[PDB]
Amino acid sequence: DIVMTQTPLSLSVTPGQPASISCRSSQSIVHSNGNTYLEWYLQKPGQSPQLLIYKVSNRFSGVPDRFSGSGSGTDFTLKISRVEAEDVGVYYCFQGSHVPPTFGGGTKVEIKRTVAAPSVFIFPPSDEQLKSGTASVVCLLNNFYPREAKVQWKVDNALQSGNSQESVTEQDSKDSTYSLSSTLTLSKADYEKHKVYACEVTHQGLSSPVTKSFNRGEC
Amino acid sequence: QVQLQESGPGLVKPSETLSLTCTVSGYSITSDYAWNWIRQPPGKGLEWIGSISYSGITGYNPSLKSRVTISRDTSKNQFSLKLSSVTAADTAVYYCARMGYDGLAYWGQGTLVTVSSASTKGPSVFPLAPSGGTAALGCLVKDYFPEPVTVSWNSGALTSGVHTFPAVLQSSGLYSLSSVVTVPSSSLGTQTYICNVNHKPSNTKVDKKAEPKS
């Protein structure tokens, strides 16, 4: 099989600036008919891959545009001449010259941009959930950059460990920010035992840590 | 418009046979091109499984060949994949795609197949109740298996300011995810905010209002 090795593994690029991705193949991907079936795809967050380039350098659009493919034999390059917010995702090279067709490992392309501090929101558990003996408390960190963020749960001044989970969105294709959701899970009994629920957020945005909280019972 | 549409996501028990179809519209499978299967296991890259040509000729990934079968059903303009003896290593998003000399120009939307003995379970849906200015609100979609769930707001009318986060597998072995949207406090308001939750593997639809509590 032909191994397709992409470099680098990931890229951060300031909007309007160029990027370059390399794809090297462990053996030639020139086919016996002379053609080189080397193709580039972009896979945007949560989507199917989409073809950008085929036969080394042919643009999918058919017209001159920001994507340029070059190279030959075992060594290929995708250039993006002026990266835009919308270009963010994972790029794959692909060869269909020799069976089995193989893809590269992918190069994740992110937009380098200025600091944005998160907006923080806390959500108590619904009365509906409580009926069932579990309480989820949710803290939302909205629209921040860079991705690095620290969320701490406190219940009546006690830091919580090993009872929360969090997820981060992919880089928004418009504003290039991230969002983060964290869930503290308690039994209903434990939730009703305590009073003050807080998520405390630290981020390069924030010369001081932001705390949002509620007291169980105030309406 | 050429369109490819894979069958729906769900569970297959280990040791059994994963079975998928791709239905093609706007183009006949026997006109031309080759009709591919490609998968992407969680957080990994893309692997070519095999294809069938317009003329019925099949090609397989040598590594997978002894477990794979691909066929065409020209009466429904469909082509199929079977993958036998599966394990957790075969849990992946499976894509169908059309190949020509000039690339994999068309793809299906991708269908997640989870290989587990675990049972299907449908979600519960809880409100997340709503500086200066802008409020946040959402739905918590809890205790479901397998993935995926889809979420929309006001039946797809509301898309600006929506964030639907990757699900987390809880200690129970069931998934939980949240979907939020930021809106103007003042609309809070004259305006109903409803989340539309669809879990195909269990055939569950639920709509929940995200209302500000009293």
Binding site: N35, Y37, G96 | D32, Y33, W48, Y54, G59, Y101
Partner: peptide, 14 residues
């Protein structure tokens, strides 16, 4: 040996 791009279509590639 089936499955390659070169084999994908009815008319030969140019």
């Amino acid at each position: 040996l089936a499955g390659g791009s070169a084999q994908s279509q009815r008319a030969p590639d140019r």
